[PDB]
């Protein structure tokens, strides 16, 4: 007998696949972390030593990709017994997430990107995907190496900076500041490979996306590096983010926030705008001040049952458009060459199974991988 | 005999009591520093080994905070010899202060917040209660720690940021700078659990609150937190200082400052035009070029003798209005669970004895208990 | 009826009493978190509105101090996903903690001073009493200020300052630099009125105790206020400290090392060594495998049952030893007029409540009072 | 017709094996770059797309691991036209190199680690591994972060670092600073997960291993993190090395020095000595004349040629003793589940075809992969 387990042969068999585009009833075999085939019928003999799972009747898609978490905890807002904990490794894989995107909001003195970077790394060695933003509401951002362009460039999970314009809890910044700031995480992506991208954590003042436009008009950054989050939190802002995303941008709905523009609401809305689901993302704000991720499943539970979308349509926004926001090679879509990362649900859209790059983490609902020190 | 001398029991009976309320003939009973019962005829009894305080036919109010104080001494403005000595305890108390805010002045070369913080701490361990405001009137701010958000957050007894404007001794301050130190303040504050607040040394500028309008405009801290003072200075300002608590701004009016706009004056004038008390507060800015603190109750004398207010009204602006705008737990009102902070005066609002933390600091209106090197 | 609630009158009646001195049969009265009288036979209606406790039967003491616990999680020796987790505050009131001192190790990169800092201040604002030393392994020490000194003169908290040798995870620190070090604790706590010692991490060198020796011939701090701690490591570095202890220091013995030097043993051996108990203390290094808490109650409990110890020494390293060390005024003994921290444990040494200040966190040997974020 | 393309399934077939231990006759098949089974007759169907290699009559060993290359070129002792070149992609391949550890020499004034970090990841983007050392000859170290702990704490790519002693170009360092600064790379890799060594340049100064011997007697740094390199300089150097290696070190032999101790009789004579192959390495301080990488395969053949070695035997020092010293994960062996980094040779040590990552990179003894700008 030969032994072909280091390849860890496995073949998911029988499932409705979403890919997330609707692929009808097909087969996915999977290889060192990797899906390798993709197709109806995929003989239960095509490599030795196979872990088969028979998946008929349920539904194959992608993993979540949630860009927006408060990994090593956040809060503080209300004195330091109110700064939230680190995120624990099941809560994540529980709610579907297999990629996730860690950043600071408002305290940046008890809280730094070299926390944010450790824990970031520990989430990629117990089993998940993970990077971060360097930076935090604070501007000028407080970085690792002391320049957002060299953090980007030179520090391997960073792919962009965070910052708070529009909130009774930013830093007063100045277009001039703003404008430095988005083209060095701009520049730093470029020379590092990576997207680049400025996330703008938005706030209720009423000059709502003003000082984006404002720094359209400063710089020369691409419409498409920036990112307004938390478009959902009010009217007028949530309005104003639907003409940015006309004019070419993307736009991050945060599931957490369920008025006055709920979740589904504001997705099915862009759509009907006239916004191509490429241009919307979803994220969580998880970890913040303790908020939760189950918010994202249920959002997709809702567009399809009480907005009229497709699985597959009801899918883009925490896959395939998050993964094309940050360009995540191998993530948001079952391809051959691409990650394992995929979620097992049942028809009715709840969760049984999740495998991060092949590893089985999740088992009839519940986690059966744990963090380091899960209790 | 059992010895219960550690719990300090003090029963003040017979006063009339203003909470600043008028509480009619109200006893008032203390232990350890704390009030913990506020009621007409308590036993004498009560409570073992009680020290009782026959009040009768006096007035019993809340001790004063004033929060505009020298207390490392200021001036210098015409060189060297013109620098002020530190404050001595028993000049506050015989003045009717037991809480206190120190800051700084136009010199900030001579004079550091580090002297400042040791006085702060100093006159806490004498028996009153006091806080300071990190920077000076330059700006950008010297700091202890290099940044007015974390000296905010993390110095204990850091609660806000000083600065000048409109002053001809002002570091011509722009906007952004204005903007961005009193948005580290805020979002310290909110760290540190402080009130977070920017106060204004206003001169006499025709441009008077001109710059504190443009500051709104450029960032989103709340009105409430920033704090313009010396407003009686001159008449526009004054009045523009009128408009500006109007919009739901708080103002501080100096006791020290005689003309054109006497103090209570001022506070006469606050009230007809419509201003709650709550948005008015009154300091000495005492120890100042030297300043003294006998216009504190000066004022308060005034305003009942010639302005036709109340003892209560009279009290608030140096009493619940000053707690209230900075958010000092347990003082400025007598109720149980507060610190035990209290006047003794006679009807005709002489001092006669002051209470700080429950310690008889005070007695026949002369000191009992003094600075550590006071002769 | 009036209301005198707000003292918080609770008579602890009769249960023996060890002080940690054994008083026999003794009351206890409480009033605003402190201890205000001690005596047999205190009336049940001496006070008003009080909460009487039947402590028949039971024991009283003194709430443990545990000077050496990774408030903010520690670990990381072994890569990111080793980083532990921050301290949960029921898990310290449930072991009987109710006074700790938060410090790091070997992991200054991902682990900061100001987390520590504001963990420190959220466990003091939940319930308990909370201190830090700054620093950590590395020399020169990572502080807040930028100086040792200044560390620990103004920030209130900080009480000293840590580093490690003979440990092969040191920084390989000279004389000079460790000399500076600790005479910079000594000068800052004297000017903050703090103990200023420097607690020295010990490791399996064969150099052991030397660099402390080496120390003190090269400066003029004195010998008690230099803490080696994991004494009972290894054998030879344990005989040295019984003669470091002979000299006048003072040595701290880990409770979560249980070989080759058991703790109890350990303080056994001081004890027939000649050394005074009020040289040795005892600390868990609690959250530092993942380090627990109760091996401090264990330590005690075999002390008494197979050492032969009274219950009032075995409770000194715990107690008045340490208070008595780092100068915890209030702390380590009932007294009146000391803070209102308190043990009652069954005859069999099993914790059943604890007072914290005066309130009520474990009650049936189970918190009643939670962190902010436990679940 | 299902594509499985995606797993560029491969087998080596029939090669006689040296793992570097002697496998006989023995099949290799690869899966995504990975290794996934060695075994006598793989049955060329096992798996489907799977490319067939012919490897009878040949020689299948691992890859060459060089860990002392100047990647960006070095050079510069005499004056700027003597800085040399950066390597090209093809000229490690075609020398059967497919891992390599960068550094820096003399000149870090016109050569930067930031240069060398952009370097080393553009060769693991073309193929290959890298990972590099931060500092340079000079002391104090010139790192990227500013600090040598946090350098190998967080920059991925870097292990360890670099220093110069005993030598006519060094910073004449005394043994603090070498010792601080071993003692910070060391805890800097436990943090990182990196070997954590410090690698040492000698020069041709009597004084040889000394400060090594210094160093270890002033800092708990283990003896097998520090790497004594280019020890075949000089003979008296030479003969400390060995007893050096004697105690527990690793000895790195330079293949581009001839004299006065040629590379194959170096490692003869550390085997005549009695020191077990696993502590003796072989490195090419190619691209620092201008060096090439022709030495280190010259020396596998003359050893097994002209001095009886085994050929297992000889490829220790570039293969599993690296793999080993650097604890490089994957590397320096073919075993189920490493890295698809192998060579092909003929029975006479020639090198015919190279894969690294499972990538045919050079065929028939030229490359068919190269570097972006190869022309
Ligand atoms: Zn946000
Ligand atoms: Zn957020
Ligand atoms: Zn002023
Ligand atoms: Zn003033
Ligand atoms: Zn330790
Ligand atoms: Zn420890
Ligand atoms: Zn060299
Ligand atoms: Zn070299």
Redesign the interface.
């Known amino acids: 007998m030969?032994?072909?387990?280091?390849?860890g042969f496995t073949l998911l068999q029988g499932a409705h696949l979403y890919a997330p585009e609707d692929r009808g009833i097909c087969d996915v075999?999977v290889?060192?972390?990797?899906?390798?085939?993709v197709?109806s019928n995929?003989p239960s003999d095509?490599?030795?030593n196979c872990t088969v799972v028979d998946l008929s009747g349920q539904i194959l898609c992608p993993g979540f990709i949630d860009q927006h978490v408060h990994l090593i905890g956040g809060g503080?807002?209300?004195?330091?017994?109110?700064?939230?904990?680190?995120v624990a490794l099941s809560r994540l894989t529980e709610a579907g997430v297999t990629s996730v995107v860690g950043l600071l909001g408002?305290?940046s003195?008890?809280?730094?990107p070299?926390?944010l970077?450790?824990?970031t790394?520990?989430l990629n060695?117990?089993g998940i995907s993970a990077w971060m933003l360097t930076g935090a509401?604070?501007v000028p951002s407080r970085t690792?190496?002391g320049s957002v362009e060299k953090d980007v460039a030179?520090?391997?999970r960073v792919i962009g900076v965070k910052c708070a314009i529009?909130?009774?809890?930013?830093?007063?910044?100045?277009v001039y500041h703003l404008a430095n700031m988005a083209a060095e995480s701009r520049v730093g992506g470029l020379?590092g490979g990576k997207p680049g991208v400025t996330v703008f954590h938005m706030?209720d003042?009423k000059?709502a996306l003003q000082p984006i436009y404002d720094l359209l008009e400063n710089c020369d950054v691409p419409i498409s590096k920036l990112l307004p989050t938390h478009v959902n939190r009010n009217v007028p802002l949530f309005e104003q983010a639907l003409e940015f995303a006309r004019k070419g941008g993307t736009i991050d709905i945060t599931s957490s926030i369920d008025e006055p523009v709920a979740p589904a609401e504001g997705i099915a809305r862009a759509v009907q705008a006239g916004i191509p689901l490429a241009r919307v993302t979803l994220s969580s704000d998880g970890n913040g001040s303790?908020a939760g991720f189950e918010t994202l499943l249920e959002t997709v539970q809702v567009l399809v049952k009480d907005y009229d979308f497709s699985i597959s349509d009801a899918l883009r926004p925490l896959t395939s458009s998050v993964a094309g926001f940050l360009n995540l090679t191998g993530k948001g879509e079952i391809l051959?060459?691409n990650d394992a990362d995929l979620l097992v649900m049942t028809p009715e859209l709840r969760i049984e199974q999740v495998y991060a790059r092949g590893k089985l983490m999740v088992k009839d609902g519940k986690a059966c991988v744990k963090?380091?020190?899960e209790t």
Chains 1, 2 share one sequence.
Do not use: C, M, Q
């Open positions: 030969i032994d072909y387990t280091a390849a075999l290889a060192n972390g990797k899906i390798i085939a197709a995929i095509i490599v030795p503080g807002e209300a004195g330091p017994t109110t700064r939230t904990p680190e408002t305290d003195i008890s809280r730094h070299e926390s970077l450790a824990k790394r520990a060695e117990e509401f604070h690792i190496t030179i520090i391997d529009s909130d009774h809890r930013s830093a007063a910044p100045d020379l706030g003042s000059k303790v051959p060459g963090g380091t020190f």
